[PDB]
Amino acid sequence: GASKLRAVLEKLKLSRDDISTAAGMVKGVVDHLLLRLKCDSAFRGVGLLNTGSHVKISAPNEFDVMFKLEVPRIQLEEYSNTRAYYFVKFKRNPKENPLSQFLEGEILSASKMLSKFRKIIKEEINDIKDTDVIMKRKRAVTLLISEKISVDITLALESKSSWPASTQEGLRIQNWLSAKVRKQLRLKPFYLVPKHAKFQEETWRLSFSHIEKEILNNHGKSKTCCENKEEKCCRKDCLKLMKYLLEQLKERFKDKKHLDKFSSYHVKTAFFHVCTQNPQDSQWDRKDLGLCFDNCVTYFLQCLRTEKLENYFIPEFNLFSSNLIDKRSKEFLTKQIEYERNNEFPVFDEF
Amino acid sequence: GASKLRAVLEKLKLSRDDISTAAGMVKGVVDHLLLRLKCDSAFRGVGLLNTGSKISAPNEFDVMFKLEVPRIQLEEYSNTRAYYFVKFKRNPKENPLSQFLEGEILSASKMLSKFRKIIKEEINDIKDTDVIMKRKRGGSPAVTLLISEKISVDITLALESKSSWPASTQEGLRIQNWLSAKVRKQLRLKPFYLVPKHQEETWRLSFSHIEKEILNNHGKSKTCCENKEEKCCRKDCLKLMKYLLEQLKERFKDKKHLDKFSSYHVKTAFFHVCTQNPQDSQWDRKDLGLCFDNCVTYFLQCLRTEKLENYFIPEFNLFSSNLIDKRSKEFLTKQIEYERNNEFPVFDE
Ligand SMILES: Oc1cc(-c2ccccc2)nc2nnnn12
Ligand SMILES: Oc1cc(-c2ccccc2)nc2nnnn12
Ligand SMILES: Oc1cc(-c2ccccc2)nc2nnnn12
Ligand SMILES: [Zn+2]
Ligand SMILES: [Zn+2]
């Protein structure tokens, strides 16, 4: 039964037009912040990474923006055999490095880097008069435009180097998107977002947000997938429904605090794993949406039970490790998803 | 019947290993010429566009030398949708090619002369191999070298423009139902080249790079020719069409009719057949004989009707009566039809 699923997708599609006006407010504020950030020597080569402007299917008043900063000849040192967290050290000596001010030894400080970023942003939001902009407290930088629109702003270092060795056996798209696409994609840059690891406040985590967008917007085995009536698939619709399932349950149990650790990234990672399992476009037929979404729900639940959700790019990194998410939280999310699946998804009818 | 076709392809595949040694000699000479060419102010940003990787000629290599030109303005010559005059848009800073300006227009002749002059000067200086420069024949194959008395290298100069493709290409590259519209959008965002081809002041459009991309990523499916269940015969049909023309051109070299026909005509016609048959199922390995017969058949229709449109410039007809006379197309038709009727005797060896 896909009827109620297709009904949800149409209701979600009705929020599309309002996202245009809201994006206009965000484009204004972000263009301003990038003009003022480019004035500082450190953040001179700062730019917009070119994806979002949504990241929450039930949130037109929520936008995510990424600010790329190209870093020239960098050396990475993997922190404590975590295949995702690294220390950013510099390789060349000439000429003087613009980020020298944030070096806490030979290692670039994430904390000192993000503090200056937060400081310049706090300073420039008071000077912008077009709209009312407030900066939200530490929980990278979240703004609130005209008391409605929230903007999550991330700083990401860009490296045009070859991807770290931890990614060598990841991105298993060879039997789905082809090995020739995998070769082309790995030649693209990689990003590092400042994220500390279990209290190491000097580490950076790998980011492949750009590759995830490429793979989602060119998602079929066939190059003409979703370009004609005979080749329409339900891949994107399954992801939208999985994302919405978690958002609705997270909203339902916001006062409980269990589901706070789960994100749309867990849903998206699990979705790419199901795409690797079902490489044929015939396995994603529009008529089979109900059955396709049930495999996605089912795979996601297996990851929760087995406490195993590997990062799509870093196979050895487990997003569902007991050290990251406690078993009782995964058991609560399992309980809730199973109830929903057993009662024809009541949480879809805004519950 | 594909047996004799598959046999020819295996014999052509046996020339592959010798092409490695020969390419080594060419990589040496070309890397030298590019190092010396980069010394001149005009040809500073010169680079190789990478063709050094005729199906019956391992002692014959073609190389393209790209040169990026910044803010160029094109003026279409006499409603030819392929020939253009190269002008420059901005004023600051001074243009490195100012020496070749024959008015506000960049001279092809003055540009190619300096190119031929630096190349003639550097072939005498380079050691460890005997290199001779062959005399003028055509404007498109611009400078021809002869390494160690065996290897011929055709060196072409091409201007690179990162601008949007001219309006004459707007309705070309009909790969939307085969390679997808999203690929067509990605491909058109790439640069375009202009090779000096004459009116001895014009430049012709070149999309050699797009032809290579389309040939090396040729299926509807992204995994086409990456597994036993997805092996196609597209490349093999092109290799056989190219070899059919080369063998007939050799046979009638003393007659002079087929001199105007090139592998580009065969390749253009092949891309038109790919547009007609967008499905990988239409190019099954088992159906090679039937696939090659459609290619032969389409090519013959173009010869009879005197109509072979450029794959990128629809309004440009490569088989125009003004380019190739009717009696020459009729001779090539006669010969191809005889070959097809007698199980291709020109193939066997
Ligand atoms: O782009 C990303 C990346 C990651 C991430 C987590 C663990 C290891 C590696 C990468 N998590 C994320 N959560 N939201 N976005 N997002
Ligand atoms: O790349 C090309 C392009 C052309 C060509 C001919 C007529 C109009 C436009 C372009 N002809 C060619 N012959 N060999 N290569 N090659
Ligand atoms: O080599 C040939 C060629 C032809 C032939 C016929 C019509 C037009 C052109 C060529 N016919 C032939 N009959 N025997 N040999 N043979
Ligand atoms: Zn699709
Ligand atoms: Zn193929």
Author numbering:
A (entry chain A): 161 to 213, 217 to 302, 307 to 365, 370 to 522
B (entry chain B): 161 to 213, 219 to 363, 371 to 521
Question: What do the authors report?
Answer:
Cyclic GMP-AMP synthase (cGAS) is the most recently identified member of the family of cytosolic DNA sensors. Cytosolic cGAS binds dsDNA and in the presence of ATP and GTP catalyzes the production of the recently characterized second messenger 2′, 3′- cyclic AMP-GMP (cGAMP) which then binds to Stimulator of Interferon Genes (STING). In humans, the binding of the cGAS product to STING causes a conformational change resulting in recruitment of TBK1, and interferon-inducible gene activation and interferon production via IRF3 phosphorylation and nuclear translocation. Activation of cGAS is important in host defense against pathogens, but uncontrolled activation of the cGAS pathway has been implicated in autoinflammatory disease.
Although DNA-binding compounds may indirectly inhibit cGAS activity, to our knowledge no inhibitor shown to bind directly to the cGAS active site has been reported. To discover cGAS active site inhibitors we used NMR screening of a fragment library and identified a compound that binds competitively with cGAMP.
